[PDB]
RNA sequence: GCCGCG
DNA sequence: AATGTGCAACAGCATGATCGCGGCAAGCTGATCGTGCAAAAGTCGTGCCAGC
């Protein structure tokens, strides 16, 4: 059996563990994703015409200022649908190549370990055939009654 | 002392004050521009490629002169971590260290245990070498020595011998050596299962049921003892198709 | 230093202490070693 | 057969004595520290309620007779019987493998 | 369509168990239905709910 | 056979009463339960061939 | 009765293989279609097969040749 | 949850 | 001579801390309303023929 959630939700298994898989896949700290996943702050996507970045952690007041100034072109949302949208748009091979070039061009011990961890995770995802959009779960299974 | 030390030895924990070691030729260098940071920066040229070490000056320096200090020498007094022993003095040196220090705990009380049973445990702590050269699809990552040995054997056999990449062996405690094995069914039944399944689920790996706990869990014949003979028959059929 | 893959040579490992002869192929020596090291400890004065 | 065993006639006792003949059962003590903590013995039927243990093996079990209890398991297979007879018998493990 | 055994054939040869993330379509594939009502058992007839 | 194999129990009992002393092992129910518990998470685990 | 299985162990030396050989022989004698080659002292099939191995008249190779002979006969 | 047994 | 970068110390959080066995009570405690209507299903008071 199964449950249709009618609203995307995140998997605590991967979101909340010390080497957060989704957190370092997004290359952003755990606190920002935790705040956006519980509707404390928004996150924007695209908006190239406006000054907003690709991964802004703009809050409600910043959102009001943006919609008063920028108006349109601000695709900002808060729910797990936000992580949906920003995870589907991510390109695996291009990001892996860009990060590999960044790691090989600049030598620094502090960033080298994080870069290698990110490369390892990305390569594992592209090789296993999984889709990173599957971290969060749209449909939730249920156990058999006799168990 | 005591025997929160057979635990302390097997996990290979770094002690409070490790003793520093040196390299091939320890010429007199003292310290150049010893500022308020770690002073007495020793820079032995050793002909080429000098090694710059930093000491916080809170620990005395032993060898004032050169005396042609070789690798593994005691630059400063103190207990030695097993990791330093393995990196510099060799694999046989760390085995004699752990065996002698563990047996000291048992001998002092009056317990007889053969040295064979400690070298077996140490052998399971000396897996997973770190690769430092490339060309064989590996570059600066920790892989099992068994896989590193077979990769070298095939690469050396072929004409392109230079592809074979040397490694730097690594030492892991018992609690960290068991959780990192290639079978995810094992190491999920012993310590943190939330972390082990999460990294196995993402990587999409398989177990292949090669050990003892994997076969015990699924109710098959273990590959040891009277079940060893049966497991060999299955292996040859798999290779033959 | 047995250098064999996924196991240990019957010659690199000595004779099994339980019986006088050399060890036979297929004897699970890891569990035996772990039990031998861990059977004491209840008599180590910590 | 079930009713006859329930009523436990004398012939049931004779047949029980017959099936016990060369069927080793294996005993273990609670803190099975090493592998000598579980050993296979040939049973001898006794009139009582307490298991009788050979004194010599006690040092292997770390067992004293001051309220200790032991568990009995029956290896109900041909292969298991040969394994108990040729690997777990008290006459097989004389030296400690440590 | 008789003389069928399903418990015996339920045991199939296997080796090398594998693990990976579960896609939503695969989750639908496992399921034999969708639950919408939370009720566990009713007492009017002592039967599982629809 | 002794504990978890649901059909192994009955087969072993019938073999003993017959006088066969044959194992005919199988698949422990505990591992099927564990597979269902893992699958009830967001994780897919299966038996490959 | 075999109190100790040392003789069978030196006859075919593994301490692990004679369990399999004796299990096969005991199965042959217990399921049916075979009779002991050693006098029977009302023992079980287990120690009977062990005695047969100890006497040196049963091992893996000759068991295989007897199986082949039976197959060729039919 | 408590108590005891080796 | 003012400035940016990499390294190290301190705080917070995750994890695990023996194996069997026996006996006794108390919790184990546990509910989403009504809705008011067709639509269906069932039921009851009544009359029917067939057997003695
Ligand atoms: Mg006692
Ligand atoms: Zn060897």
Transcribe B105-134 into DSSP letters. Answer: HHHHHT----THHHHHHHHTTS--EEE---
Q: Which two tokens stand for residue B82?
A: 């097993």
- Contact indicator for B215, B209 with CB cutoff of 8 Å: yes
Identify the DSSP state of B219: T
Nucleotide nearest to B195 (CA to C1'): I14
Q: Kindly tell me the sign of the dihedral angle through the C-alpha atoms of D46, D50, D55, D58.
A: positive
By Cβ distance, the residue of F26, F44, F48 closest to E22 is: F44
Query: Which chain D residues touch F25 with a CB distance below 8 Å?
Result: none
Minimum-distance nucleotide, CA of D29 to C1'? I20
Cα–Cα distance, B220 to F25 (Å, whole number): 8
- In Å, how far are A62, B72, C42 from C39, measured between CA atoms? 65, 35, 7
The candidate with the shortest Cα–Cα distance to B145, out of B130, B158, B135, is B130
Min Cα separation E13/chain B (Å): 12
Q: What angle do CA B4, B123, A18 make, to 5 degrees?
A: 65
Query: How many CB pairs below 8 Å do chains B and D form together?
Result: 7
Scanning chain F, the segments in alpha helix (DSSP H) are: 6-18, 29-39
Q: Which long-range contacts (CB under 8 A, 24 or more apart) does G3-6 make?
A: G3/D91, G4/D89, G4/D91, G4/D92, G5/D85, G5/D86, G5/D89, G5/D92, G5/G50
Q: What is the largest CA-CA distance in chain C?
A: 39
**Through-space separation of residue E44 CA and nucleotide I30 C1' in angstroms:** 16
D91 with G3: Cβ contact below 8 A: yes
Q: Do A147 and F37 touch (CB under 8 A)?
A: yes
Q: G57 CB near a chain D CB, below 8 Å? A: no
**CA B132 to ligand 1 centroid distance, Å:** 56
A119 touches chain B (CB under 8 A): no
| Angle (deg, nearest 10), helices B226-240 and G17-31 | 90
Shortest alpha-carbon distance between residue B227 and chain A (Å): 33
- CA A137 to chain CA centroid, nearest Å: 14
What are B181's strand-pairing partners?
none
A75 contacts A45 by C-beta, under 8 angstroms: yes
Alpha-carbon gap, residue G50 to G57, rounded angstroms: 11
Using a CB–CB cutoff of 8 Å, tell me whether B117 touches chain D.
yes
Which chains pack against A, by 3+ Cβ pairs within 8 A? B, E, F
Q: Tokens for D30?
A: 């609670």
> G29: number of CA atoms within 13 Å, CB side?
23
Structure-block tokens of residue G49: 């097969």
Task: For chain A, give the number of residues.
Answer: 147
Residue with tokens 């893996």: G60
Rounded distance between C-alpha atoms, residue B168 and residue B158, angstroms = 23
Find residue E41's DSSP bridge partners: E48
How many Cα atoms sit within 13 Å of B217 on the Cβ side? Answer: 24
* Dihedral-angle region of residue B33 (phi above 0 means left; psi in -120 to 50 means alpha; beta otherwise): left
Residue partners of B76: CB distance under 8 A and separation at least 6: B19, B20, B55, B59, B60, B61, B62
CA–CA separation, A82 and A88 (whole Å): 10
Phi, psi for residue B196 in degrees, rounded to 5: -70, -45
Q: Give which of G44, F17, B229 is closest to D78, Cα–Cα.
A: G44
CB contact under 8 A, E19 and B202: no
Strand B129-131 to B167-168 pairing? antiparallel
CA–CA gap between residue D51 and residue C11 (Å, rounded): 42
List chain H nucleotides near protein: any atom < 7 Å from a Cβ: 5-6
Distance F9 CA to I52 C1' (A): 62
C28 is in an annotated binding site: no
- Max Cα-Cα span within chain B: 69
A21 CA vs I14 C1’ separation (Å) = 16
Which of F4, F31, F42 to mutate against chain B (most B CBs within 10 Å)?
A: F31
Is residue G23 within 8 Å of residue D78, measured between CB atoms?
yes
Among D55, D59, D42, smallest CA distance to D96 is for D59
Question: How does DSSP classify residue G46?
Answer: H
Nucleotide minimizing C1' to CA distance for residue D64 = H6
| Interatomic CA–C1' length for residue E37 and nucleotide I40, angstroms | 24
> For residues G3 and D85, what is the distance between their CA atoms, to the nearest angstrom?
9
Q: Which residues of G touch F22 (CB under 8 A)?
A: 27
- C36 to chain D, any CB pair closer than 8 A? The answer is yes
Kindly determine whether the C-beta of residue B191 is less than 7 Å away from any atom of nucleic acid strand I: yes
Structure tokens at C44: 């180590």
The C-alpha atoms of residue G11 and residue G53 are separated, in whole angstroms, by 7
**A10: distance to nearest CA of chain F, Å?**
10
Nearest by Cα to F46 from D60, E17, G4: E17
Distance from CA of B188 to the nearest CA of E (A): 13
Question: Quick check: C19 and G15 CB within 8 A?
Answer: yes
Chain F environment of E17 (Cβ under 8 Å): 45-48
Report DSSP letters for A96-115, one per residue.
Answer: HHHHHHHHHHS--HHHHHHH
Distance separating the N- and C-terminal Cα atoms of chain D: 48
Distance C9 CA to ligand 2 centre (A): 4
* Three-state SS at D82: helix
């Amino acid at each position: 059996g199964h449950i249709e959630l009618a609203s995307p939700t995140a998997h605590i298994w991967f979101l909340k563990s010390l080497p957060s898989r989704i957190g370092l896949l997004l290359d952003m700290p755990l606190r920002d994703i935790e705040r956006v996943l519980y509707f404390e702050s928004y996150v924007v996507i695209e908006g190239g015409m406006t000054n907003l970045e690709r991964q802004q952690i703009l809050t409600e007041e910043q959102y009001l200022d943006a919609l008063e100034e920028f108006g349109d072109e601000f695709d900002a949302k808060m729910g797990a649908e936000a992580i949906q949208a920003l995870l589907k748009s991510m390109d695996l091979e291009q990001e892996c190549e860009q990060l590999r070039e960044e790691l090989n061009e600049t030598n620094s011990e502090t960033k080298r370990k994080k870069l290698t961890k990110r490369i390892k995770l990305l390569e594992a995802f592209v090789q296993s055939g999984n889709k990173p959009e599957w971290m969060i779960l749209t449909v939730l299974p249920v156990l058999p009654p006799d168990l | 002392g005591g025997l929160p030390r057979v635990a302390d030895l097997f996990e290979a924990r770094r002690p409070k004050e490790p003793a520093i070691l040196a390299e091939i030729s320890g010429i007199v260098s003292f310290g150049k521009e010893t500022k308020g940071k770690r002073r007495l920066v020793i820079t032995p040229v050793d002909g080429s490629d000098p090694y710059e070490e930093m000491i916080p000056k809170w620990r005395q320096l032993n060898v004032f002169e050169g005396e042609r200090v070789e690798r593994g020498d005691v630059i400063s007094d103190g207990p030695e971590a097993p990791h330093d022993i393995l990196r510099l003095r060799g694999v046989h040196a760390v085995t004699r260290y752990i065996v002698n220090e563990v047996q000291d705990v048992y001998r002092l009380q009056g317990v007889k245990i053969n040295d064979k049973h400690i070298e077996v445990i140490v052998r399971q702590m000396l897996r997973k070498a770190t690769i430092v050269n490339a060309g064989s699809s590996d570059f600066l990552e920790g892989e099992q020595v068994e896989y590193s040995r077979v990769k070298i054997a095939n690469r050396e056999l072929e004409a392109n011998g230079k592809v074979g990449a040397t490694y730097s062996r690594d030492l892991l405690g018992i609690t960290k050596a068991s959780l990192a094995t290639e079978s995810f069914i094992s190491a999920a039944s012993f310590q943190e299962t939330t972390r082990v399944l999460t990294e196995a689920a993402v990587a999409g790996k398989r177990d292949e049921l090669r050990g003892l706990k994997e076969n015990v869990i699924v109710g098959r014949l273990i590959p040891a003892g009277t079940g060893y003979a049966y497991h060999q028959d299955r292996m040859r059929r798999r290779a033959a198709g | 230093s047995c250098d064999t893959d996924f196991g240990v040579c019957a010659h690199c490992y000595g004779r099994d202490l339980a019986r006088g002869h050399i060890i036979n192929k297929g004897e699970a020596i890891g569990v035996i070693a772990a039990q031998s090291i861990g059977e004491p400890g209840t008599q180590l004065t910590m | 057969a079930k009713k006859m065993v329930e009523r436990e006639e004398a012939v049931v006792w004779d047949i029980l004595d017959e099936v016990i003949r060369e069927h080793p059962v294996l005993l273990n003590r609670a803190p099975t520290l090493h592998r000598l903590g579980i050993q296979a013995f040939e049973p001898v039927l006794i009139e009582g309620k307490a298991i009788q243990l050979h004194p010599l093996v006690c040092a292997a079990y770390n067992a004293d007779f001051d309220g200790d209890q032991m568990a009995v398991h029956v290896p109900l297979t041909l292969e298991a019987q040969l394994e108990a007879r040729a690997l777990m018998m008290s006459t097989n493990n004389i030296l400690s493998p440590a | 369509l008789l003389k069928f055994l399903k418990a015996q054939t339920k045991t199939e040869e296997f080796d090398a168990i594998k693990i990976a993330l579960a896609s939503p379509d695969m989750i639908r594939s496992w399921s034999f239905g969708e639950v919408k009502k939370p009720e566990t058992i009713n007492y009017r007839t002592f039967k599982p709910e629809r | 056979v002794k504990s978890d194999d649901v059909n192994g129990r009955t087969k072993m009992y019938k073999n003993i009463v017959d006088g066969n002393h044959q194992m005919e092992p199988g698949m422990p129910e505990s591992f099927n339960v564990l597979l269902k518990e893992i699958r009830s998470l967001g994780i897919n685990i299966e038996l490959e061939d | 009765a075999r109190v100790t299985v040392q003789d069978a162990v030196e006859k075919i030396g593994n301490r692990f293989d004679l369990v399999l050989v004796a299990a096969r022989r005991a199965r042959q004698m217990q399921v049916g279609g075979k009779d002991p080659l050693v006098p029977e002292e009302n023992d079980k099939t287990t120690v009977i097969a062990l005695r047969e191995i100890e006497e040196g008249l049963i091992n893996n190779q000759i068991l295989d040749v007897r199986e082949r002979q039976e197959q060729q006969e039919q």
